[PDB]
Design a protein around this ligand. Structure first.
Ligand SMILES: Nc1ncnc2c1ncn2[C@@H]1O[C@H](COP(=O)(O)OP(=O)(O)O)[C@@H](O)[C@H]1O
Ligand SMILES: NC(=O)NCCC[C@H](N)C(=O)O
Ligand SMILES: [Mg+2]
Length: 356
């Protein structure tokens, strides 16, 4: 680690201390001891502590504030990652290891809202990293192009329900891009948390989206993770949505090598996405319970759920529509993660019906 970087870290640490109302896990867990213990360390790819905490230093409204530039970072900077990961995922000890992949019995999942008055749409995503490629901040432009080639070529072999077409962001019309984002299908462009993590270099080179014609099965290429594999549709038929995701991921896994860690399960760029990498969500209206989004969030938290705005994290609810999902992804199985959403949403709906 050089001097210019040390200077910036000391100043960043200072900034976090002075931000009396900053509530990120970065601020909470980057103690002086922790800070001093790892600030002079560097990975084989040259990732430093600055590359890890910079997004959280610059964006004090971060909930977490850190990312892993490469896989090594998770251990090189363990003293910071470890407490943050344990905290976010609701208990995960130094000696704990994420369980083996287990989709569980899909037939035990139910329709989340049969009368159709609360839930708008249901979505399940996972993320994967390609073996042999580091995370965004360590990628070159050429690697983005190489990965895009590997993934798009693989997805051309999908068949039946999953058969579809790859659409590069490069050459994509502004109108087509904006509509896909508005309809909740395509990742947004220009995220300040990702940008400051240097996760968006060379944009839009290598970025794009694959989907079947119905857009119930989608794969994001080279956004936050190398792949995000998504199943979604209108309504509350979680069983179908989840079954389609399982089929797609099992099939893609036989073709592409993805990075998996004995302790952290599937590796991802953000520590919140480790393990199952799974975020199962609904877009839902709960007018009585949502009469104050902070009350809504307090209720959700007891069910281990997270509340986001309509256009994703770091956005507001529009027209009473909230994104509610399992928060935890690591230290529980895929089945357990999706069941936390199912169970929590079914009960929150019951509470809404009962509320005055
Ligand atoms: N249950 C859902 N139904 C429809 N669209 C959804 C649902 N949950 C999330 N989305 C959309 O997914 C996109 C990604 O949002 P983000 O909050 O960035 O999720 P991720 O963890 O998938 O990256 C946004 O456009 C958001 O509207
Ligand atoms: N909504 C979320 O919890 N997103 C995961 C972390 C995103 C961003 N780096 C943050 O810390 O807010
Ligand atoms: Mg996202």
């Amino acid at each position: 680690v050089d001097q210019a970087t040390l200077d910036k870290l000391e100043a960043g640490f200072k900034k976090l201390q002075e931000a009396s109302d900053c509530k990120s896990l970065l601020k909470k867990h980057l103690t002086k001891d922790v800070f001093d213990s790892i600030k002079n360390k560097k990975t084989g790819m040259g990732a430093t502590l600055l590359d890890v905490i910079q997004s959280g230093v610059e964006n004090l409204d971060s909930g977490v504030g850190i990312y892993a530039p490469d896989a090594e970072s998770y251990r090189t900077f363990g003293p910071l990652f470890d407490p943050i990961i344990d905290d976010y995922h609701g208990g995960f000890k130094l000696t704990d290891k994420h369980p083996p992949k287990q989709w569980g019995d899909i037939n035990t999942l139910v329709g989340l809202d049969p009368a159709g008055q609360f839930i708008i749409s249901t979505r399940v995503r996972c993320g994967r990293s390609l073996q042999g490629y580091p995370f965004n901040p360590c990628l070159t432009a050429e690697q983005y192009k190489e990965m895009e080639e590997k993934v798009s070529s693989t997805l051309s072999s999908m068949e039946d329900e999953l058969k579809g077409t790859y659409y590069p962001l490069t050459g994509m019309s502004k109108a087509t891009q904006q509509q896909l984002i508005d309809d909740h299908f395509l990742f947004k462009e220009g995220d300040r948390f990702l940008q400051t993590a240097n996760a968006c270099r060379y944009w839009p080179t290598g970025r794009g989206i694959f989907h079947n014609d119905a857009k119930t099965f989608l794969v994001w290429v080279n956004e936050e993770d190398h792949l995000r594999i998504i199943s979604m549709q209108k309504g509350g038929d979680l069983k179908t949505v989840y079954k389609r995701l399982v089929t797609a991921v099992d099939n893609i896994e036989s073709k592409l090598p993805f990075s998996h860690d004995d302790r952290f399960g599937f590796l991802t760029f953000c520590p919140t996405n480790l393990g199952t990498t799974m975020r199962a969500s609904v877009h839902i209206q709960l007018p009585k319970l949502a009469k104050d989004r902070k009350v809504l969030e307090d209720i959700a938290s007891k069910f281990n759920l997270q509340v986001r705005g309509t256009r994703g994290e770091h956005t507001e609810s529009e027209g009473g529509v909230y994104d509610i999902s399992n928060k935890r992804r690591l230290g529980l199985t895929e089945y357990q993660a999706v069941r936390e959403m199912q169970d929590g949403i079914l009960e929150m709906i019951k509470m809404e019906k009962a509320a005055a």
